[PDB]
Every structure is written in structure tokens, then in C-alpha cells.
Structure 1
């Protein structure tokens, strides 16, 4: 009942913000630009500093004309409406949002420890206890999101930032969506796509649990289970129902992964009658104190090295491009609700 009441309150609080979203809570000239942390086909993430408070933030900047072109309108509206409504220890917090003639802006807490991806590639692979510490946080985060009828749809090491305490903060809600029942959009990253996405089925939260299997495998092995030069070759392996495990994997890990990387979504852990408890009660998680993880009372496997809230050392170097704002409003109608 403790968990039931926790999730009932979480849903109440989410729905209140979901039905009355915040809007237009800062503006661009409230900030100084520091550094580009990442660049994409329709947006960027910038380290910025608030000129009055001195606080640092990560500012996600989306070009409205490119969002339209790349058919991401609904997705960008999803991202912001969800982020301003959620509240969980392992989700990056949205602090402000606004738009101008050219761009959409989401101003997030800055997490200076960098992407899990960097640390994993630097060390090679994580020990099972280390992988399990991160995986437990994703299990609880999906328990939370799925109870809100949210599917995340972009789990991968690049989207998990490591904070000052060594805990995870999930970033990038660009493909997150509120879904009752099924949804159909092809999105995600190839290595992490569930078979039912590849096969163009109506799919549900089970795709997040598949992706968790991929993530745990990659954390523990150093590479993802389905790998190839071309996406179509990756997709053939995903749909095949065949995975090879390193001999150093524990039997418990292999058993969990066979049940998360279950190609038949009606048999996949997280999508059965017992829901998330099939995962939480699995032998691979026998040492996990779920409440202690939630309360951030567990000592982390490692603390990222960084010098302060403005340190960018754990992010990499990108060409510094203008944040241009047109004299004329672009795509006003499309983004009215943002």
C-alpha cells in the first residue's frame, strides 16, 4: 500500500501540472552563454549562466523551422509538456521554458558529471554491482513514468547523466509521450529498438523494458547486444531472438536479460501481470534496497571528477554557432501551446 499510495500521489501531482502547463517563465537575455555541450539536427544544448542569480543551467535550444521540417512538432510539444509536469529523483529538472521568433528553449538543471556513455567507454565495462546500481534507478524511474501513462522511448547511455552524488539523471524527453494503450511512431536509436517498433506494430511501455535489457547488457559487457555497420543489419539481429552473452556474465544476469530481451512482448518482463515486480524481485536485484536507492542513501560506484557547477570538462568540444533570433515570427501557430 505504501507504493500504491506513493504512485497515486505522484499521478495526482503530475496531472495537475499536465492539465495546466507552465509557459514563458524566462527569456533569453536573462542568461549568458558559456559553452555548447552538444549539437543535433534541429537543436543544441548550451551551458548558460543566469545573470542575476549566477546559477548554471543546461539550455536546450530547438530551431522551430527545423523541427517542422524533421516532423518533430508533436514530439517537441510532448517533451516540454511532460518535463514541466514530472518530479522524480532520477529525472533532470526543468527550471524554465520559453520561445521566441525562431527557437524553443528548455532550461534544465546542469549535471556536470557528463554522460554515462563517456564513463562507460572510458572504463570499458561496469562491474555487475555498478551496472545494477544504475539499472535500479532506471527501474524505479520507469515504474514512475509508466504509472503516469508515459513511455520514455529513448533509453541509451548518452541520455543518462551522472550527477555530483554519482546518481543518474535521465535527460532528453524528445521521444517521451503520454500513451494510454498503444502508440505507433518509429523513433528511438537503432541499437535499442524493440522488435515491435522495427516491425511497425502498435506498441506500449514494454519497449522501455526491452531497452533496459539492452542498457544492462551494454553496461556489463561494454558493447550492446545487437551491433552492426548498417541499421538493417542491427534490425535483423534484434528480431531474431538470439543473443550471445559474455562468459563473465553471472547466471542471474543472463536470466534477467533473457526475460527483458524477450522478443515476444506478451512474455517480456515488465509487461506481465506482476508488472515491474517481476524485475524488482529477480535474483539479479537481490542485493538492491529499492527504498535506499530512491532516498539516495546508497554510496555510489563513483563520483565524477569536476571542479564546480560551471565545469564542462566531462562534456566535449563543438563548434560555437550563433543563437540567431529572426526579426519575424516563425511557425507561431504550430507551437502555440509551448
Structure 2
């Protein structure tokens, strides 16, 4: 067969250890999920430094410790007018319960008469999107280093029955060590079985979302396929002037690859960008292992990635500098509106 005794024993032991890790991780998540933290700081603990439809994201400095943070500010009356109560509550509830090295950390949260505040660790490299458009495309080893972190993060999230549903370079921050931080859990949902909401970004939508079917966590594995393609090509597999033309391409079962893609990469992508759910990697009897054991990941040391011991291929220019972010006009922050609705926050 493909593996001799030694390799087969090592792989089996590694897979059993993953199961053991995930079982403990689920116990810890569920304790925090059932008893969320609340009101762990206040606004005058922070200096506002710079702005980076529901609200704003600001770089702030903790007055006592000097640490910088990215503070998400949501206007309560505006969340309720846009029908975003459940999504806002759920995002904060998820963030305070999860713990993984590639998931942004919620360090504090609180509220006042007018706003909700989520104080996140500041990730100074900015979004992968900008780096990818600047560099053009990532070489396959560079793409694979990021892809491996998303695989591990989805393995973690899916074990908690969380579906993520908005993977894209725009939502991937690069930290000072060159590792990924997944941000933005506004569309994530705890889903044991199927769910039905039309949500996501057009280029990253799985066919079963477009075709108005009930769907499951396999939509995240489709989206990983789109992400790996876009990272390695510099453009996504399915694009057009208007979303409806993108969707026609997504459901067609046809994808074309640049000539510089390796055969291993094309094979992986054909199995992730698989319209037939009975054939899509991540959705089969062997689960995430079909992805982790694919030839394209043969050089990936999954534990070393998790332990952040792999030298990253790219370190963003390390100037609390805002070198890797844009500039915006600075409106003020004024302050008991919408009390009942946000009792749980």
C-alpha cells in the first residue's frame, strides 16, 4: 500500500491524538459557552488612537498597561434597526468561548448607554487581502502555510459544531510572526445538522448555498478550496462582472487552473471544489483526514504549525503602528438605549 508499517502507525497515533485534543477543547468551549463573560473593562480604561454599517473599529491603547487593542464599537440603536441583534450577541458569545492560536482573541467586552464594545487583540499586519493584491500571488509553499492554519482552525471550529461561513482573504489578519488570525464571526452559527441562511460572499459561496439547499459544514471546505486557489493564482476560480454570472460558474462543475499550478494542487482543488457533496473532501467518511493526508500537504508538519514553530514565509513590516491599515475621518463617540435586547452582552 502507500504506507509502510512505521508511517501507518505514526499517522494513526497522530489522528487519535487529534481526537483526544478536540474532546478536551470541546469541554472547555462548552463551559464558557454556557456561562459567558461580561463587563470586563470600561471605556475610560482606553485612549482612542485611530479609526481602522453597524459600527467602527478603532485602535485603542490601554491606559494602565500600554497595550494596544482593536476595539469594535457597535451602536445599539443601529444594530436593532438593521435586525442584527442575534448576530451581534452570537458573535460575542462565540468569541468569548473559543480558544485557538489562529483565532483572534477577545480580551475585554463591556457596554454603556449607547454602544457595545468588543476589545480584540490588535493584529498589526492587517488583512491578507492587501498583501495578496500587492504581491500578486503567493507561491505554493507560501499558500500552503496559510492553508494549513485554516484547515486546523476549521477542524477545531467544526468539532464544536460551529460553521464559519465567511472565509475570504479580507477576513484573515497576519500577525507579527506571520501567522493567520481569523476574524469576523458575524455569520458563524452553531449547527449540528443543516442550516438554510443565504449568507457569505459571492466568490466564496458553495453551490448548495446558491441552489437554495439545506447545507452543512462542507460549505467551509468548499470555501477553503476557493481561498487556496485565490492565494496561489492571485484571483479566484469563479468571477464575473455580476454575482449571477459568478453563481452560474460555481454550479457548473467546471473550474480552470493556471498552467503554473502543480498537479498536486489541482487534484486537491478539484476535490475541494467538488459540486457533488458525496465526493467533496471534508464531507466523506474520513473527514478532515482526506485533506490533511493529501499529497499537496505531504511536507506539512501539522503539530509544528499548531505550535507556531514553523518559520513563516512573510513577516509584515513591523513599524502600535498603523502602517498596514488605511485612514478614515474621525467621528466622536457619544453616550440607556436598547437595554432589554442586549442583556446578555
* TM-score, structure 1 normalization: 0.95
Cα distance in 2 for partners of 1:192, 1:27 equals 37
Q: CA deviation at 1:256?
A: 0.5
Contact (CA 8 Å) 1:266, 1:272: kept in 2 or not?
yes
Contact (CA 8 Å) 1:306, 1:314: kept in 2 or not?
no
SS of residue matched to 1:129:
helix
* TM-score, structure 2 normalization: 0.93
Cα distance in 1 for partners of 2:271, 2:254 equals 12
Show CA shifts across 1:38-81 (max 9, x none). Answer: xxx11221100111111100011112222223222211111100
Q: CA deviation at 1:4?
A: 1.2
Cα distance in 2 for partners of 1:253, 1:82 equals 33
Contact (CA 8 Å) 1:11, 1:148: kept in 2 or not?
yes
Q: CA deviation at 1:104?
A: 1.4
Count of residue pairs the alignment pairs up: 330
Q: CA deviation at 1:210?
A: 0.7
Higher RCO, 1 or 2 (CA under 8 Å, sep at least 6)? 1
Contact (CA 8 Å) 1:226, 1:237: kept in 2 or not?
yes
Residue 328 (structure 2) aligns with: 318
Show CA shifts across 1:184-233 (max 9, x none). Answer: 22211111111111222221111110110010000000011111222222
Q: CA deviation at 1:98?
A: 1.2
Cα distance in 2 for partners of 1:192, 1:261 equals 10
Cα distance in 2 for partners of 1:95, 1:183 equals 30
SS of residue matched to 1:334:
helix
Q: CA deviation at 1:306?
A: 1.9
Q: Which has the larger radius of gyration?
A: 2
Cα distance in 2 for partners of 1:63, 1:268 equals 41
Q: CA deviation at 1:293?
A: 0.5
- Select between 155-164 and 231-240 the one with higher mean Cα deviation: 231-240
Cα distance in 2 for partners of 1:232, 1:64 equals 34
Cα distance in 2 for partners of 1:6, 1:19 equals 20
Q: CA deviation at 1:99?
A: 1.5
Matches within 5 A, 1:1-338: 1-37=16-52, 41-307=53-319, 310-325=320-335, 329-338=336-345
Cα distance in 2 for partners of 1:184, 1:69 equals 23
Show CA shifts across 1:240-297 (max 9, x none). Answer: 2111110110111111111111112232111111110000000110110111101111
SS of residue matched to 2:23:
helix
Cα distance in 2 for partners of 1:71, 1:198 equals 23
Dislocated runs of 4+, deviation >3 Å: none
CA RMSD of superposed structures (Å): 1.1
SS of residue matched to 2:91:
helix
Show CA shifts across 1:122-171 (max 9, x none). Answer: 10000000000000000000000000111111100011111111110111
Gapped regions of structure 2 (runs ≥ 5): 1-15
Cα distance in 2 for partners of 1:62, 1:197 equals 29
Cα distance in 1 for partners of 2:202, 2:188 equals 16
Contact (CA 8 Å) 1:150, 1:176: kept in 2 or not?
yes
Going from structure 1 to structure 2, the CA distance change for 1:240 and 1:66 (only over 3 Å counts) comes to farther
Cα distance in 2 for partners of 1:99, 1:202 equals 36
Cα distance in 2 for partners of 1:233, 1:65 equals 37
Contact (CA 8 Å) 1:151, 1:177: kept in 2 or not?
yes
Cα distance in 1 for partners of 2:279, 2:337 equals 47
SS of residue matched to 2:130:
helix
